[PDB]
Write a protein that binds this ligand. Structure first.
Ligand SMILES: [Zn+2]
Ligand SMILES: [Zn+2]
Ligand SMILES: [Zn+2]
Ligand SMILES: [Zn+2]
Lengths: 444, 444
């Protein structure tokens, strides 16, 4: 254990690049606790593999720097996230957001595109549903649409991640279609789930009207209100909230789709590290000050949820690290990783002060981005960037000839802090995380 | 701190994919020891990042399987390995074998291509020179040429990794050239270093004659003999060795260059996963039965070295994982990872039985290979493989339009077992490893 893992001094001198100030043995032995966790905060950086963590650190903090949030969790390991082929039931080495999110929130592997159901299309309870049933307060925050697979997996059981609202569900998930006697679209099941705090984007799907049931004819936004949900649409009003519970659930819709990314930079190009000058990221001017940052949502959710005496389970997702990775946009991708680090600092500060909180930071799968040599002549999309070290770092995206770079199957880092954090060390599976949380809370 | 990390049962069923059988807390707390290490075995998988480990596991053992050696080390972490730019002294995000090997064996960062010297070209003692001085037995094994960067870094101090023997040193490392008053080429410094056990390839540089000094005119191979080295060139003779020490140092030269790779498979190609059938690796027919495997060399080295009462330091390197990665050859690369896993099992079996041995498995840097979806249309070199799961796994190499795929800068896995293993957990730097070993052995 250690809180400062930055290089000690002059990285060109003996011992200057070291991150360790002493022996971790005792410190580590002290952070090993099997006492129950009262709360759990699971932070997910979408598509944030080791490569993404390194690129952002090199850029934002420098090679020898360290993320005060992301790099500060003492217990580390690597975990696998392979999905399953629906027909064969054999492994599918590269998972999507849905199958992986389902794995950690359910404890069962599934096929790509599935939310809350195994390869047989059978429903399985998510950790959020189990926490709510035990009396704990529940939160779900993300910078993406709330209907995205990661936040949706905790509250929805759909056969296809594309079944956002009533209209998509009728054509793509008919067995789930409300009219067909199913539980409903992702959005409808989210509304039913009734988590205490739900914050993110995806307001546009709420403008759809239910095709059947008690709120038929009424838009989903209207139904939320009729059901007792407090709706907030910006930083100001969010901030104004004083409580959120089963009588007064909070629902923040901060964008029609995904919330705007924090940084602006050009898209990587073929031979860009050669033909184009080094870029320096800038703030995204299209992003309004009224739009909450992930740390803000995380912080507000912790405040409201910490009022519950039994404890709480909260999931936070920095979604656009993945989206900008697909877009081959280094600046957008790094900004979203810096953004998530902030949300991680908020969680850590709370956890260190409370003492019964298990904080976990990981990703759903690996992605395309690679850090290559400045002079690299690659076949894909590349870009040179000016880092905090005053050096150029080149990033490469070369696994797709399409407009979207692809996920990768490499095992990746999973880090934790708090009671039961030891269960994250060594090699584990994404499904283990579910059992780790279920047992830390004693949610059996 | 478990030994079996394979999926529990049916990966399609709830909990079937889990690798954990219980709670690691107690087990982990028990494997944390700060008592001094009597011995240390450092295994290096060249260019063996997390992606490489995953691809080989998926192929050789199946997605839900586990490397009995590589994946069985309980204390895990991620470490950085950026090099330095010689001019500026600023970070160079993607290191080579030379700059990284120098970092863990010396504790100082350096520029790419440097062996045993910092950016000012100043010499720094290596962990092997320090162990030998304290009376410990020393071993150095690799599947590559012994003049090659990783093994050379422990015994040579050269400004350019290209200074193999007398002839190359005169033109490329004149300040080290023996005639110019320098310490000599890599091969000459290796001969001088006099480690108890040195096994590998690179016999061809030993056919060069020294240009000055006591053994001038005499080939390097003749010099070795004149200096009291026992030369063995195949498995049978290796095996026949009964002792190796300072009076009778062992020198195994099993190949002119790098030792032959274990598996054969075709080179990945543009749209190979689409236009070509899935391949299944086979054993390399050019590889002679008389050529020792890494595990055999590792095993024999442990045997000879464990006779020293003070203890020993042994470094083992599975070098061709990297070379095949550069070559865009999945089968050669996976075979070399399986090869290394066996050497790791040997190290672990000894360590678990001896009890004062620190075993560390890591890599010098990340590489090109990525696991992508079966249908991926990538701009680079791809290939489909038939895995143990009876499923297809696609591998992609898309960071170079040249004939050699490039290294990548992503932080990677470092795993350890034994006294002082806790110093590997969390985020660390490649230079910390040096301090971890120095302190474990009390080599102050
Ligand atoms: Zn994702
Ligand atoms: Zn994605
Ligand atoms: Zn290497
Ligand atoms: Zn290499």
């Amino acid at each position: 254990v250690l809180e400062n893992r930055a290089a000690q001094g002059n990285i060109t001198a003996p011992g200057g690049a070291r991150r360790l100030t002493g022996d971790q043995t005792a410190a580590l032995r002290n952070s090993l606790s099997d006492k129950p966790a009262k709360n759990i905060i699971l932070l997910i950086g979408d598509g944030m593999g080791d490569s993404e963590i390194t690129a952002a650190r090199n850029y934002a903090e420098g090679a020898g720097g360290f993320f005060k949030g992301i790099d500060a969790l003492p217990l580390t390991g690597q975990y696998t996230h392979y999905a399953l082929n629906k027909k064969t039931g054999k492994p599918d080495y590269v998972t999507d957001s849905a199958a992986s999110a389902t794995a950690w929130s359910t404890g069962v592997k599934t096929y790509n595109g599935a939310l809350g159901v195994d390869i047989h299309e059978k429903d399985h309870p998510t950790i959020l549903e189990m926490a709510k049933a035990a009396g704990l307060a529940t939160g779900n925050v993300s910078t993406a649409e709330l209907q995205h697979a990661t936040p949706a997996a905790l509250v929805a059981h759909v056969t296809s991640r594309k079944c956002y609202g009533p209209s998509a569900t009728s054509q793509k998930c008919p067995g789930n279609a409300l009219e067909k006697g199913g539980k409903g679209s992702i959005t409808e099941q989210l509304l039913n789930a009734r988590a205490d705090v739900t914050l993110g984007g995806g307001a546009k799907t709420f403008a759809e009207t239910a095709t059947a049931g008690e709120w038929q004819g009424k838009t989903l936004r209207e139904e939320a209100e009729a059901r007792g949900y407090q709706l907030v649409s910006d930083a100001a009003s969010l901030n104004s909230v004083t409580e959120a519970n089963q009588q007064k659930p909070l629902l923040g819709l901060f964008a029609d789709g995904n919330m705007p990314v924090r940084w602006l930079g050009p898209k990587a190009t073929y031979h860009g590290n050669i033909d184009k000058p080094a870029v320096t990221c800038t703030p995204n001017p299209q992003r309004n000050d009224s739009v909450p940052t992930l740390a803000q949502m995380t912080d507000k959710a912790i405040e409201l949820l910490s009022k519950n005496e039994k404890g709480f389970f909260l999931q936070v997702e920095g979604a656009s690290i993945d989206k900008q990775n697909h877009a081959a946009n280094p600046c957008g991708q790094i900004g979203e990783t810096v953004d998530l680090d902030e949300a991680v600092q908020r969680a850590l500060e709370f956890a260190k002060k409370e003492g019964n909180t298990l904080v976990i930071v990981t990703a759903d799968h690996a992605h395309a981005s690679q850090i290559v040599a400045p002079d690299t002549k690659a076949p894909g999309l590349t870009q040179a960037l000016n880092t905090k070290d005053g050096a150029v770092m080149v990033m490469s995206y070369g696994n797709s000839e399409e407009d979207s770079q692809e996920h990768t199957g490499s095992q990746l880092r999973i880090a934790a802090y708090g009671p039961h954090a030891a269960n994250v060390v060594g090699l584990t599976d994404q499904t283990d995380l579910f059992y780790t949380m279920k047992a830390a809370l004693g949610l059996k």
